[PDB]
Amino acid sequence: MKQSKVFIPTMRDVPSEAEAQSHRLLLKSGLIKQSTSGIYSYLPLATRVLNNITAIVRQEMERIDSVEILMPALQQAELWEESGRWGAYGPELMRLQDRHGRQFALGPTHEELVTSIVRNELKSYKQLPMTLFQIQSKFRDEKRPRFGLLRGREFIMKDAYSFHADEASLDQTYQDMYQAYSRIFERVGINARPVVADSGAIGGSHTHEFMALSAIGEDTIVYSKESDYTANIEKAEVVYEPNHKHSTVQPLEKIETPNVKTAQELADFLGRPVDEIAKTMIFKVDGEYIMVLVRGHHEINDIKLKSYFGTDNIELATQDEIVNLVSLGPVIDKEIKIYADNFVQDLNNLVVGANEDGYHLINVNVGRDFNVDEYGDFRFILEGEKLSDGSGVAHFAEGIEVGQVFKLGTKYSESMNATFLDNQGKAQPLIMGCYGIGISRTLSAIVEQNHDDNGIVWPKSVTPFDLHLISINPKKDDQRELADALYAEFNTKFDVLYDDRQERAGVKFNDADLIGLPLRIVVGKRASEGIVEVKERLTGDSEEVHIDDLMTVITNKYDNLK
Ligand X SMILES: Nc1ncnc2c1ncn2[C@@H]1O[C@H](COP(=O)(O)OP(=O)(O)NP(=O)(O)O)[C@@H](O)[C@H]1O
Ligand Y SMILES: O=C(C[C@@H]1CCCCN1)Cn1cnc2cc(Cl)c(F)cc2c1=O
Minimum CB separation of residue 456 from ligand X in Å reads: 19
What is the smallest separation between the CB atom of 219 and Mg ion, expressed in angstroms? 10
Other residues' Cβ atoms within 10 Å of the Cβ of residue 85: 18
Choosing from 159, 377, 466, 500, the residue that interacts with ligand Y (CB under 6 A) is: 159
**Which of 220, 301, 413, 440 touches ligand X by CB under 6 A?**
440
Q: Which residue of 13, 16, 87, 91 would you call a contact of a copy of itself, by CB under 8 A?
A: 91
Of 210 and 283, the one with the shorter C-beta distance to Mg ion is: 210
Q: Does 232 bind ligand X (CB under 6 A)?
A: no
H or E element in which residue 367 lies: none
Kindly tell me which of 162 and 404 has the beta carbon lying closer to Mg ion: 404
- In the bound complex, what is the minimum distance in angstroms from residue 481's beta carbon to ligand X? 42
Q: Which stretch binds ligand X (CB under 6 A): 23-31, 344-352, 395-403, 446-454?
A: 395-403
Minimal distance, residue 181 CB to ligand Y, in Å: 11
Q: Which helix (H) or strand (E) holds 431?
A: strand 431-438
- Residue number closest to ligand X, CB atom: 438
Q: Do 190 and 459 contact (CB within 8 A), yes or no? A: no
Q: Which stretch binds a copy of itself (CB under 8 A): 112-120, 265-273, 330-338, 371-379?
A: 112-120
Judged on CB neighbours under 10 Å (0-12, 13-18, 19+), 450 is: buried
Identified binder of ligand Y from the candidate list 6, 48, 75, 108, rule CB under 6 A = 108
CA atoms within 13 A on the CB side of 242: 4
Please state the closest distance from residue 184 (CB atom) to ligand X, in A: 12
- Is 151 an interacting residue with respect to ligand X (CB under 6 A)? yes
510: contact with a copy of itself by CB under 8 A: no
340 is a contact residue toward a copy of itself (CB under 8 A)? no
Integer angstrom CA distances of residue 361 from 252, 290, 365, 433: 7, 20, 11, 52
The distance of closest approach from Cβ of residue 157 to ligand X in the complex, given in angstroms and rounded to an integer, is: 5
Q: Counting contacts by CB under 5 A, is residue 207 touching Mg ion?
A: no
Question: From the list ligand Y, ligand X, Mg ion, none, which binds 92 (C-beta under 5 to 8 Å, kind-based)?
Answer: ligand Y
Among 23, 24, 28, 140, binds ligand Y (CB under 6 A): 140
Give the CA radius of gyration of the chain: 29
**73-to-113, 139, 214 alpha-carbon distances in Å:** 10, 8, 31
Minimal distance in Å, beta carbon 140 to ligand X?
A: 5
State whether residue 256 is helix, strand or coil: strand
Q: Phi/psi of residue 227, each to 5°?
A: -110, -175
Q: What are phi and psi of 122, to 5 degrees?
A: -80, 90
The interface with Mg ion within residues 387-406 (CB under 5 A) comprises: 404
Give the 3-state secondary structure of residue 357: coil
Segment near ligand Y (CB under 6 A); pick from 87-95, 255-263, 394-402, 545-553 = 87-95
Strands (E), 98-203: 103-106, 130-139, 154-164, 192-196
Instruction: Identify any residues that bridge with 105 across adjacent strands, giving them in sequence order.
Output: 75, 95
3-state SS class at 31: coil
- In the list ligand X, ligand Y, a copy of itself, none, the entry touching 137 (Cβ below 5 to 8 angstroms by class) is a copy of itself
Annotate 104-126 with b (16+ C-beta within 10 A) or e (fewer): bbbbbbbbbbbbbbbbeebeebe
CA distances from 3 to 45, 465, 487 (A): 11, 11, 12
Question: Whose Cβ is closer to ligand X: residue 194's or residue 296's?
Answer: 194
For residue 314, the minimal CB distance to ligand Y (Å) is 17
- Residue 517 touches which of a copy of itself, Mg ion, ligand X, none (Cβ within 5-8 Å per kind): none
Cα–Cα dist 272/281, whole Å:
21
Nearer to a copy of itself, 394 or 467 (CB): 467
Distances (CA, A) of 68 to 47, 133, 136: 20, 5, 11
Choose the contact partner of 403 out of Mg ion, ligand X, a copy of itself, none; CB within 5 to 8 A by kind: ligand X
Does position 488 interact with a copy of itself (CB under 8 A)? The reply is no
Q: Which of 259, 492, 502, 556 binds a copy of itself (CB under 8 A)?
A: 502
Q: CA-CA-CA-CA torsion for 258, 264, 270, 274, nearest 10 degrees?
A: 150
What are the start-end ranges of the H helices in 314-395? 319-325
Contact flags string 58-97 toward ligand X, x per CB under 6 A: ----------------------------------------
- Residue 137: beta bridge partners? 156
Q: Which of 19, 65, 142, 543 binds ligand X (CB under 6 A)?
A: 142
Q: At what angle do helices 547-559 and 477-490 cross, to 10 degrees?
A: 50
Total residues contacting ligand Y by CB under 6 A comes to 11
According to CB under 8 A, which residues from 7 to 66 bind a copy of itself? 7, 9, 33, 35-36, 39-44, 46-48, 50-51, 62, 65
Residue 89 found at the interface with ligand Y (CB under 6 A): yes
**What is residue 387's DSSP assignment?**
P
> Which position among 436, 455, 464, 516 is part of the footprint of ligand Y (CB under 6 A)?
436
Nearest CA among 73, 195, 185, 90 for reference residue 143: 90
CB contact burial 1-19 (16+ within 10 A = b; e otherwise): bebeebebebeeeeeeebe
For position 403 contacting ligand X by CB under 6 A, the verdict is yes
Task: Kindly list the residues in this chain that would bind a copy of itself in the complex (CB under 8 A).
Answer: 1-2, 4-7, 9, 33, 35-36, 39-44, 46-48, 50-51, 62, 65, 67-76, 79, 91-92, 94-96, 98-99, 106, 113, 116-118, 121-122, 126-127, 129-132, 137, 139, 141, 143, 153-154, 502
Task: Kindly list the residues in this chain that would bind Mg ion in the complex (CB under 5 A).
Answer: 404
Task: Kindly list the residues in this chain that would bind ligand X in the complex (CB under 6 A).
Answer: 109, 140, 142, 151-152, 155, 157, 401-404, 436, 438, 440-441
